[PDB]
Amino acid sequence: MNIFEMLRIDEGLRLKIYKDTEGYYTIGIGHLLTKSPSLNAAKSELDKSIGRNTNGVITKDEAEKLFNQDVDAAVRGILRNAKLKPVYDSLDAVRRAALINMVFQMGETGVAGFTNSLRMLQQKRWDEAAVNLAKSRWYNQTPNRAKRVITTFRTGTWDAYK
Numbered sequence: 001m002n003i004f005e006m007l008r009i010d011e012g013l014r015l016k017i018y019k020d021t022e023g024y025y026t027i028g029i030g031h032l033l034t035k036s037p038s039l040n041a042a043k044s045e046l047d048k049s050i051g052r053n054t055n056g057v058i059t060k061d062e063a064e065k066l067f068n069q070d071v072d073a074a075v076r077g078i079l080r081n082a083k084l085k086p087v088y089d090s091l092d093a094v095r096r097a098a099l100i101n102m103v104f105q106m107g108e109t110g111v112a113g114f115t116n117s118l119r120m121l122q123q124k125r126w127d128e129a130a131v132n133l134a135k136s137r138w139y140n141q142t143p144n145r146a147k148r149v150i151t152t153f154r155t156g157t158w159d160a161y162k
């Protein structure tokens with residue numbers, strides 16, 4: 001199991017523009033296109049993102065290409081972030097995957113906002129961090145996915161994904 005397979009499980013793969021859990025236009029493996037309510041605004045961003053007139057539909061390779069860019073950007077965002085970087089450097093390989101997953105889903109800004117949990121992760125207080133992470137809109141809105149990530153941070157294994 002690695003970050004790619006983990007995120008592929010959490011986000012699924014759709015080749016036609018769809019609406020995410022928040023109602024925003026998305027495509028591929030969790031690639032947010034726009035928060036705008038306009039489907040035309042979405043197709044436009046999609047075409048700009050792929051470099052061709054897609055008419056709202058892409059191939060598997062194109063989805064995979066977006067996904068590789070997105071995980072790359074997630075990692076790089078963590079490393080450039082003053083609040084995140086230290087947490088990431090402190091963690092083992094599996095738990096690093098869990099932090100990357102949160103960032104990919106909610107953005108660097110969003111994650112950087114979990115001040116207390118980040119401090120607990122940094123100190124390796126696993127059970128405490130898991131309890132604090134659950135007190136969030138994130139957990140209440142996407143509980144099954146949050147539970148998986150939380151279990152990953154608590155145990156340091158891929159059990160929730162197996």
Ligand SMILES: [Cl-]
Pocket residue numbers: 049
């Ligand atoms: Cl893009």
Ligand SMILES: [Cl-]
Pocket residue numbers: 141142143144145146
């Ligand atoms: Cl969920």
